[PDB]
Amino acid sequence: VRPKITLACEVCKHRNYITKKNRRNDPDRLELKKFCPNCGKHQAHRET
């Protein structure tokens, strides 16, 4: 019901962060602006 999703970047596709969401309140893939250490700046992050 609350699986562990992982957040891949949108430029480099590195998998920088891991967190949990609710599957039934949020059926789509989450999008957050998170810091990417490869790019050195805040990028966008969908899930996988």
Partner: protein
């Protein structure tokens, strides 16, 4: 032994609802596979892996090299351009820009450097003889005469539900992908567009999948049934009369096997409550087998179905709907011309006609969303009107299936009574935490069930059914037609399903236009079986074609 598509241990699941689990099958070219199953079985989730739109969780699923994949979605989208521009974005999409550059290099190269652009038009003019793409003006004019498309100069925002599906089939039958993925193709198509597509998919190079609920289209375009039960896939052969045999047999040998397990729990639960005697021990190796039998007896508890239930309305008078000399159109084309009828009390009326002929416009003058040209529509003081719609315009995607029926409210009105809202939607199959799915993730078979929950809560004694037999399977198609026969008011049905108007009808209103009038209708007093015998005695005795190839190859 050369293949098209292979699945290796694919397991896609939306948590508790598994769709595949440890499946493996291979698709070879020339195969004609029709995929069946109940509503919500997972049939469109398989084709969204086979088209590369979704990814399986833990498995391998890949197309072979070459032989690209074109999918017909269950709700096919279009663009905001014309019809002739609606067929070039696919089928001609990778090849018209190679002609959009050749008519550019005829003039831009003549004033620039003529040495490096010699091969820039060289590697593109040799891409116009292997495909014969010079006739792109007149290949589109052949593919529209086959499907009987609308005229290709008007926009596509105001089209029929079965005219948008004709221009979406032309986007795929021109591409000719070697793996077709048709998701419910016979929705909204008349008895001509289905009979055409049976002959076109008969002699077709490549693999064809088609998730078709209907009993007669799959007997013509398929010879190898694929099935989806709760997770598994059962490939075999037959012509869909053997699918209802095997699903009836797979539940009679699973149903009584799960009854022998229930008697062995009662014989064993009596042992674990019987108390240890003198200094003997109750064995741990029987407690640990009871709690494995008691765990494998709760995982089999998915056996339920909800019937279609229409609320009854107030008393219906002697005058239901009267139509006197109705004329209706939008342009120089006239749809309805000089129509006179009156809806009976306590009957089922069927509206019959091909696509784009004026059937949804006939309801939208009755419900008060249009305006007649000449003649009037007259209702009466008793009638409360209930109207389901073809377009499903009431349901919005980014809102859950509960709080579209309700609006965050607990108790709703379904016509002079107050039933609870979650008790109302669970009477429409949406049970438990399936009540929090939004409308974008619901299947097509349960947006034809959610639309019946939005609009039948008006509780009226006149229901207008605008294609209700659209995405429903055989179990709930019979549950709908058994809810119209027991309905006390009057029900009006638009449908293309020949074996659905034959079963539940009392009156027929059918289009009978010909070449000199093109806009006349006909009111008949009787069932559908007596209409087809009268149709072949009034107009054209034994007269009421050859397959247009859509291409020169």
């Amino acid at each position: 032994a050369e293949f098209i598509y292979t699945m290796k241990k694919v397991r896609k699941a939306h948590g508790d609802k598994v769709i595949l689990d440890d499946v493996t099958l291979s698709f070879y070219p020339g195969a004609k596979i029709g995929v069946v199953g109940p509503n919500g079985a997972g049939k469109s989730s398989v084709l969204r892996i086979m088209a590369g739109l979704d990814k399986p969780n833990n498995g391998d699923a890949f197309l072979a090299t070459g032989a690209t994949v074109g999918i017909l979605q269950q709700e096919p989208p279009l663009n905001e351009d014309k019809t002739v521009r609606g067929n070039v974005e696919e089928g001609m999409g990778d090849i018209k820009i190679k002609l959009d550059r050749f008519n550019e290099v005829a003039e831009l190269m003549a004033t620039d450097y003529t040495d490096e652009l010699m091969e820039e038009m060289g590697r593109l003019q040799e891409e116009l003889d292997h495909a014969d793409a010079w006739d792109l003006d007149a290949q589109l004019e052949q593919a529209m005469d086959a499907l009987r498309c609308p005229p290709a100069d008007e926009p596509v925002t105001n089209l029929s539900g079965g005219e948008r599906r004709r221009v979406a089939l032309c986007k795929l039958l021109l591409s000719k992908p070697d793996l077709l993925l048709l998701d419910e193709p016979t929705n909204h198509l008349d008895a001509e567009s289905v009979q055409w597509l049976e002959q076109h998919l008969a002699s077709y190079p490549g693999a064809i999948l088609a998730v078709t609920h209907d009993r007669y289209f799959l007997d013509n375009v398929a010879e190898w049934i694929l099935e989806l039960d709760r997770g598994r896939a059962y490939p075999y052969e037959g012509n869909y009369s053997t699918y209802l045999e095997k699903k009836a047999e797979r539940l009679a040998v699973q149903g009584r096997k799960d009854a022998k397990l229930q008697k062995r729990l009662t014989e064993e639960l009596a042992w674990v409550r019987s108390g240890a005697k003198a200094r003997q021990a109750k064995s741990k190796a029987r407690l640990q087998r009871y709690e494995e039998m008691a765990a494998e007896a709760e995982k089999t508890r998915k056996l339920d179905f909800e019937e279609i239930q229409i609320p009854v309305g107030p008393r219906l008078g002697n005058v239901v709907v009267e139509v006197d000399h109705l004329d209706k159109g939008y342009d120089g084309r006239a749809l309805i011309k000089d129509l006179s009828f009156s809806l009976p009390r306590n009957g089922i009326v069927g509206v019959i006609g091909p696509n784009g002929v004026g059937k949804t416009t006939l309801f939208k003058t009755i419900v008060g969303l249009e305006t007649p040209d000449s003649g009037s529509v007259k209702v009466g003081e008793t009638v409360k009107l209930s109207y389901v719609d073809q377009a499903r315009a009431g349901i919005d995607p980014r809102k859950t299936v509960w709080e579209v029926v309700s609006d965050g409210l607990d108790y709703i009105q379904v016509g002079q009574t107050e039933v609870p809202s979650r008790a109302y939607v669970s009477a429409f199959g949406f049970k438990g935490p399936d009540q929090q799915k939004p409308a974008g993730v619901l299947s097509g078979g349960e947006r034809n069930r959610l639309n019946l929950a939005l609009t039948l809560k008006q509780g009226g004694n006149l229901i207008l059914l605008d294609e209700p037999t659209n995405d429903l399977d055989v179990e709930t198609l019979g549950s709908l037609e058994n809810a119209l026969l027991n309905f006390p008011g009057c029900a009006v049905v638009i449908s293309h399903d020949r074996w659905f108007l034959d079963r539940t009808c009392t009156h027929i209103l059918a289009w009978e236009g010909d070449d000199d009038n093109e806009a006349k209708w006909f009111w008949f007093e009787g069932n559908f079986g007596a209409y087809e015998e009268n149709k072949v005695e009034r107009l054209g005795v034994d007269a009421a074609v050859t397959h247009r190839k859509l291409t020169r190859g």
